[PDB]
Amino acid sequence: MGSSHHHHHSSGLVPRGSHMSLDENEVAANVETRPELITRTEEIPFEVIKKENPNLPAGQENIITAGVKGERTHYISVLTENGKTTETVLDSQVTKEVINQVVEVGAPVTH
């Protein structure tokens, strides 16, 4: 829950269109708008959880699905500004979904 914006106390104008003359100087019209989209998968490991399973005879474990290390290729948009390339992620699909270890341990007793 770290991803969060802060656009609620700044200039809410952002016109960028107060004329009628195109200032284009490209062969056609560029690729689109944003720079090149690169990728890089980060090590996204799994994590086993502890849940209570009354169905079991107490103190009993059950490996519904052993946790397996996954991966997520992260697409970064490097913009060449001021003669420098800045690596800033933007959008990434799940490329090797990290399988979370699903284990259900029998209920303790009353606590």
Side-chain angles (χ1 to χ4, degrees), residues 17-29:
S18 58
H19 252 244
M20 294 154 89
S21 41
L22 274 292
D23 286 272
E24 215 217 52
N25 51 90
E26 301 285 315
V27 295

Side-chain angles (χ1 to χ4, degrees), residues 16-62:
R16 270 178 142 67
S18 58
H19 252 244
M20 294 154 89
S21 41
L22 274 292
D23 286 272
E24 215 217 52
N25 51 90
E26 301 285 315
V27 295
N30 211 64
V31 62
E32 270 210 39
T33 317
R34 269 98 77 262
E36 183 170 309
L37 40 146
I38 60 149
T39 29
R40 183 163 207 196
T41 185
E42 326 212 80
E43 47 152 318
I44 312 113
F46 71 85
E47 202 258 35
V48 198
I49 309 297
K50 64 197 265 178
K51 181 67 98 143
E52 51 151 50
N53 217 5
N55 184 233
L56 286 292
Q60 238 227 262
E61 301 155 326
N62 184 13

Side-chain angles (χ1 to χ4, degrees), residues 2-24:
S3 336
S4 47
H5 308 134
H6 46 21
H7 270 112
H8 217 324
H9 47 204
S10 28
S11 325
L13 302 148
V14 293
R16 270 178 142 67
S18 58
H19 252 244
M20 294 154 89
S21 41
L22 274 292
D23 286 272
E24 215 217 52

Side-chain angles (χ1 to χ4, degrees), residues 60-92:
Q60 238 227 262
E61 301 155 326
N62 184 13
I63 306 295
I64 309 303
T65 193
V68 188
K69 313 307 231 192
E71 231 101 81
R72 191 166 215 198
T73 296
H74 273 70
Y75 329 172
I76 310 89
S77 220
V78 62
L79 196 290
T80 338
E81 183 139 40
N82 294 50
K84 63 150 262 72
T85 31
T86 184
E87 50 262 332
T88 299
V89 293
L90 268 94
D91 216 287
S92 81

